[PDB]
Write a structure and sequence with these properties.
The structure is a homodimer. Chain A is α+β, with helices and mostly antiparallel strands and about 400 residues long. Chain A has 11 helices and 18 strands. The first copy, chain A, folds into 3 domains: about 160 residues, Nitric Oxide Synthase, Chain A, domain 1, CATH 3.90.340; about 100 residues, Nitric Oxide Synthase,Heme Domain, Chain A, domain 2 (Alpha-Beta Complex); about 90 residues, Nitric Oxide Synthase, Chain A, domain 3 (Bovine Endothelial Nitric Oxide Synthase Heme Domain, Chain: A,domain 3, Alpha-Beta Complex), CATH 3.90.1230. In chain A, strand 13 and strand 14 form a beta hairpin. The complex binds protoporphyrin IX containing FE (2 copies), the ligand CN(C)CCc1cccc(OCc2ccc3ccc(N)nc3c2)c1 (2 copies), 5,6,7,8-tetrahydrobiopterin (2 copies) and zinc ion (ZN). Chain A: It comes from Rattus norvegicus (Rat).
Chain lengths: ~400, ~400
């Protein structure tokens, strides 16, 4: 019942008690581990609200106070009355920061308490949503000095009036299937790019076209909007060694802003909650540039380096992969856009992990996602045993809207 | 109950029915996942069902399930259990069990080779000296002048737990590690504790950076004895880099035979506590873990210096760059000397095919993603985007405690 975790690089052992407060389920059993699987009413709601309020008033040293009891009573009434309820501003802020704190797959959680929450719960329209988002993008970008942010649109009611951002990120490049049979732009965004056109987007069929926003308000039909270009900060990619690098014509955007997840606080469901931080270098360099199902430029880069691509054992893919990533980090830092390298990030996470064990009795962590997609064993998280479990408040996946939308 | 896994690079979906034959536990619950935890005397009362489960599998695989040969064997073993409180496997059974324990090793990326395992039956061995002789024959055969073959040597099963055969070494071939009074370590830090024991047990340590540890072998529960593997039997490869002439001057070499000897082989409830087995190295085992881990030879720095890398900011990725060159060197040195080795791209590639085939013909393939994915270049290998199901099948390779912690010393 009281679990321990060893770091096999440092012999350090932490003890985990926090997992005892786990509510949701993991996918695994005593018979089968699913750790590597990508995606594993009035009576329902009150205990959920109660759990949240209990941990909320506990965090502000007012557990069992009149304020506490009052609030429990107030929400109880509202639930019994309205079959839902509304979070105080303070609770909303707390829940959001804690949903990030509890994200077991996020290596960047040391920053968790420094989260800016924009309350867009008074939003009614897709134009409204667009305004709130533009403000989010401008705030978080900050001329390259990135600040973490979340913007929270109204909570789901009866699933009929859902707010949704259809884009997977606020800022992503377009993806077009070609007559050549290949794929122009971003392969991950092909199907989306179609629905954009299906709702009327005038695609400038290019390779690095910033997608339009496709916003759905109150369960209505989604609408298109173009993010003002001067709010979309981009970084031209150049190698601090290879002058020929720039000739590959690569850029990436500075703001990673995930906009397709569902934020759960005290049983309430926020289906539109776009949030942002800054990149870890490998996210663009390894996954965005080199993945087979993405911009897959490895061959080209290795070719220009004239590596021996005849045999896998020359490790030419490896050699290039590093250069590419060195450049990503190089450009971003040159242009003074915030970015973190996998070395610094993972180091910061081990620290945070120790802090959380010390100040909270645990830290749920998904090793499969915390270990960066390159140089794994030369970062400190590789030899860190981790425990994975689900705390609430939380960020959850949710179905792609087109599959769900009552049109 | 069916389970589907998906590959997110290729959208290939596979269905696992084999996990239904899972016996042992994973360490996980519905409330917690321990998939990244390193490590998550048996009565007749429980032995026969284990024997039966095993014998059933075995007779299915030879297509004689429910045959008379099958039933008499079940009767033979039953009778021998209540009679003798244990039982002996036929050779046919031992070979099968061993191949299958490998085949079930959910952490092993080299399993495509599982059926070509050479099994040496050392169950007639009675003494440490005998153990040495068997081991030498293993090393010689497995090595085969650089053309490595898979092998496992199997010593007598455990009985009352008081007469165990053990190989105290973690691997048959390994370099000594010596702690110095200034706190620094000469040799392989992973082996410091074990080196001390050897020295204590009488070993005369040359005290260099690459001393081949002596074998420390326990028979029938007796105190272990030292033996030196004949050097002519220990194949080694000097590490040089194909472009970098200064690399050879780093003074590095490694052995060619990865031969793990501290595990436990479980077949049909029988426990084989000394079962050294061997394959060949995937390059990153030496290149990434054995050299570049902070708790090992830790040559990243020196290689980086000699490359003239900006080691001032980690944002320079000097660690990454040097790590790759070192791995390039390891593969180069090995292939130059015609000593069998595999790179992580080829190995992970082969695994995916093995896996897909295992799903078709066996209805599943237990796989531990945390261990299958290589310690560098993870996402540019096909296994990274591969979803996997982890579960334990028997026969299996299990961990056991270090014998120096459990051994009752005779004197
Ligand atoms: C500020 C610096 C941040 C960094 C460096 C960072 C880094 C990362 C990385 C590397 C991943 C793995 C994704 C991949 O490998 O491509 C991840 C996942 C995740 N991040 Fe963080 N993040 C940051 C901020 C945030 C913020 C502000 C939030 C929300 C408030 C957040 C919530 C999450 C969640 C929920 C996941 C898991 C996504 C999933 O399950 O698919 N992160 N993050
Ligand atoms: C023949 C070529 C082989 C290759 C390339 C190979 C590769 C590997 C690698 C890279 C690992 C992970 C070790 C690490 O990450 O440091 C591993 C684990 C393992 N291998 Fe294989 N192996 C081979 C042969 C064998 C053989 C012959 C057996 C047994 C008969 C075997 C049984 C195992 C087991 C049980 C593990 C997991 C050990 C543990 O749980 O700690 N392997 N293998
Ligand atoms: C839904 N699946 C098809 C895709 C899931 C997936 C795949 C690859 C990376 C993912 O990361 C999501 C994610 C979420 C939040 C982030 C916050 C900051 C940051 N730098 N990256 C972040 C990345 C998710
Ligand atoms: C007990 N833990 C502290 C360490 C166990 C461990 C750690 C790292 C690698 C390990 O490798 C096991 C192992 C077993 C069999 C192998 C067969 C062939 C091969 N190339 N590597 C093989 C590797 C074991
Ligand atoms: C903490 C973690 O379980 C441990 O360090 C594991 C991680 N993954 C690994 N993966 C491989 N292939 N080999 C290892 O030794 C380890 N070590
Ligand atoms: C199959 C596997 O679950 C999937 O490819 C995961 C593996 N680990 C990952 N880890 C991170 N950080 N991001 C990812 O997208 C993935 N993908
Ligand atoms: Zn699990």
């Amino acid at each position: 019942r009281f679990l321990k975790v060893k770091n096999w690089e440092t012999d350090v052992v932490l003890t985990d008690t926090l997992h005892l407060k786990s509510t949701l389920e993991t996918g695994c059993t005593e018979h089968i581990c699913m750790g590597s699987i990508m995606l594993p009413t009035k009576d329902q709601l009150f205990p959920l609200a109660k759990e949240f309020l209990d941990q909320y008033y506990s965090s502000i040293k007012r557990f069992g106070s009149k304020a506490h009891m009052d609030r429990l009573e107030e929400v109880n009434k509202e639930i019994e009355s309205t079959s839902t309820y509304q979070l105080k501003d303070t609770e909303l802020i707390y829940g959001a920061k804690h949903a990030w704190r509890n994200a077991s797959r996020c290596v960047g959680r040391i920053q968790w308490s420094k989260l800016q929450v924009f309350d867009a719960r008074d939003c009614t329209t897709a134009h409204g949503m667009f305004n709130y988002i533009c403000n989010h993008v401008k705030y978080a970008t900050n001329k390259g000095n990135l600040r973490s942010a979340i913007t929270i649109f109204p909570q789901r009611t009866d699933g009929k009036h859902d707010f949704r951002v259809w884009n997977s990120q606020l800022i992503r490049y377009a993806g077009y299937k070609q007559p050549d049979g290949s794929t122009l732009g971003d392969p991950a965004n092909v199907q989306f790019t179609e629905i954009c056109i299906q709702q009327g987007w005038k695609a400038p069929r290019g390779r690095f076209d910033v997608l339009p926003l496709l916003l759905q308000a109150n369960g209505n039909d989604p609408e298109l909007f173009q993010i003002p270009p001067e709010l979309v900060l981009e970084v031209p990619i150049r190698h601090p060694k290879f002058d020929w690098f720039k000739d590959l014509g690569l850029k990436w955007y500075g703001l990673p802003a995930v906009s397709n997840m569902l934020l759960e606080i005290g049983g309430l469901e926020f289906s539109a909650c776009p949030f942002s931080g800054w990149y870890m270098g490998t996210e663009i360099g390894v996954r965005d540039y080199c993945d087979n199902s993405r911009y897959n430029i490895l061959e080209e880069v290795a070719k220009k380096m004239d590596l021996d691509m005849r045999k896998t054992s020359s490790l030419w893919k490896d050699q290039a992969l590093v250069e590419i990533n060195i450049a990503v980090l190089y450009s971003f830092q040159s242009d003074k856009v915030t970015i973190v390298d996998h070395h610094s990030a993972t180091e910061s996470f081990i620290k945070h992990m120790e802090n959380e064990y010390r100040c909270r009795g645990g830290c749920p962590a998904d090793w499969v996602w915390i270990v960066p997609p390159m140089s794994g064993s030369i970062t400190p998280v590789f030899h860190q045993e981790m425990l994975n479990y689900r705390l609430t408040p939380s960020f959850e996946y949710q179905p792609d809207p087109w599959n769900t939308h009552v049109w």
